[PDB]
């Protein structure tokens, strides 16, 4: 039979109708793949930070 | 006792260049 093998013609036309969109940025990136040892300890540091801020505001309320 | 160690690397030599007859 024998047919067309490959062509990238018209493929950039299709990608640019609705795409070529830069990804959105967020304030907090996901920590997926971040070192487990750092991630394990970072959990305790954040928990303790919330306690200190909670007590400081609890002082400034009652 | 003791023997000389192979400082060289011509592992698959078993012969040498330049060693041409009639020379």
């Amino acid at each position: 039979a024998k047919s067309k093998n490959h062509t990238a013609h018209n493929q950039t036309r299709k990608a640019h109708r609705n795409g070529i969109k830069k990804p959105k940025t967020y304030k907090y990136p996901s920590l997926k793949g971040v070192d487990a040892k750092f991630k394990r300890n970072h959990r305790y540091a954040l928990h303790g930070t919330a306690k200190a801020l909670a007590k400081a505001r609890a002082e400034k309320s009652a | 006792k003791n023997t000389s160690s192979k400082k060289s690397d011509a592992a698959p030599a078993s012969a040498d260049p330049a060693k041409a007859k009639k020379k």
Binding site: K14, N18, G19, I20, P23, V34 | -
Partner: protein, 159 residues
């Protein structure tokens, strides 16, 4: 037979620079990378572990993870009509701090210094950069520089 291996077509990309083969200068191992740093990626052919794929050779990205000998860098790669977030683990031999930070971080300092100085002097200063503008009027002195007349030259053969 088609060939499409991991390092195909990297004959010159992964070559060491001319007269620059051999041991790595140790400032490479003394640099400190922090999460959020912008780094250029350039594969060193003499270190094969933690080596980037040929796509990331010449790309710039953000460090997201720091390990014993490596950093994780986030790259945005075009796949069709959108970007996909890529997370590449690279040994620090293939990584260098991006020089684009130091120009902008200095302009921030210069703008802050200029603003306070104008604030100190009670005047105003404009900090936005401007593109190069067309040049103004000017007067050309001809003392010692009387115009010399040129003409197109005839054709000659020099062989």
């Amino acid at each position: 037979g088609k060939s499409r291996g991991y390092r195909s077509g990297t004959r010159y990309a992964f070559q060491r620079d001319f007269k620059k083969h051999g041991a790595i200068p140790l400032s490479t191992y003394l640099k400190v990378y922090k999460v959020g740093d912008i780094v250029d990626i350039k594969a060193n052919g003499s270190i094969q572990k933690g080596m980037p794929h040929k796509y990331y050779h010449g790309k710039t990205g953000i460090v997201y993870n720091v390990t014993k000998s490596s950093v994780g860098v986030i790259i945005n790669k075009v796949v069709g009509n959108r970007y996909i977030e890529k997370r590449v683990n690279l040994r620090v031999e293939h990584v260098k701090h991006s020089a684009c930070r130091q120009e902008f971080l200095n302009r921030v300092k210069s703008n802050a210094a200029k603003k306070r100085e104008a604030k100190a002097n009670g005047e105003t200063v404009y900090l936005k950069r401007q593109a190069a503008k067309p040049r103004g009027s000017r007067i050309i002195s001809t003392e010692g520089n009387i115009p010399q007349t040129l003409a197109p030259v005839a054709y000659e053969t020099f062989i």
